[PDB]
């Protein structure tokens, strides 16, 4: 017979499991231990101290992660977006347009 | 300062949208989403002016 119990103390018994293979150079929705986000993971040349986990930059936006299994430093850049615009030579003169 | 204003509670329990979306059900999370919305909108208005 087992006995589960909770109290005003840290919890130190449970089992998670993700172990999902990673993919680089693709707009992917990532979730490392705790933090989450969306981006295109890529290899980097930054140097982390042995105890540090995930880097940062000015204005406090995540910019690097270290995966638990292989201990590698991966950059993070936001997934591409922008605003489309149309060039027209005037309706009366012609019909064809160009797209920027 | 506009960018740094993004991570503020504004009166909501969490400053990240996904946590409110997940950990608590919609019919009550609408209020927290509304609070974040109004805070961010006011910040943007001040910046534009």
């Amino acid at each position: 017979v087992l006995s589960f119990e909770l109290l005003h103390a840290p919890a130190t018994v449970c089992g998670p499991k993700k172990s999902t293979n990673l993919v680089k150079n693709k707009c992917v929705n990532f979730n490392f231990n705790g933090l989450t986000g969306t981006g295109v993971l890529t290899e980097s040349n930054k140097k982390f101290l042995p105890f540090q986990q995930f880097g940062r930059d000015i204005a406090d936006t995540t910019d690097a992660v270290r995966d638990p299994q292989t201990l590698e430093i991966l950059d993070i850049t936001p997934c591409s977006f922008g605003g489309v615009s149309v060039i027209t030579p005037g309706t009366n003169t012609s019909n064809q347009v160009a797209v920027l | 300062t506009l960018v740094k204003q993004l991570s503020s509670n504004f009166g909501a329990i969490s400053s990240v949208l996904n946590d409110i979306l997940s950990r608590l059900d919609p019919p009550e999370a609408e209020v927290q989403i509304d609070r974040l919305i109004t805070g961010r909108l006011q910040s943007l208005q001040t910046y534009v002016t």
Partner: peptide
């Protein structure tokens, strides 16, 4: 010389010392 700037223009350009693509920003 590089580009076509006169020496005073180059001195002015070097003397002046200077965000990026983020969540919603654009330049």
């Amino acid at each position: 010389k590089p580009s076509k700037r006169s020496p005073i223009e180059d001195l002015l350009f070097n003397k002046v010392t200077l965000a990026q693509k983020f969540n919603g920003l654009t330049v």
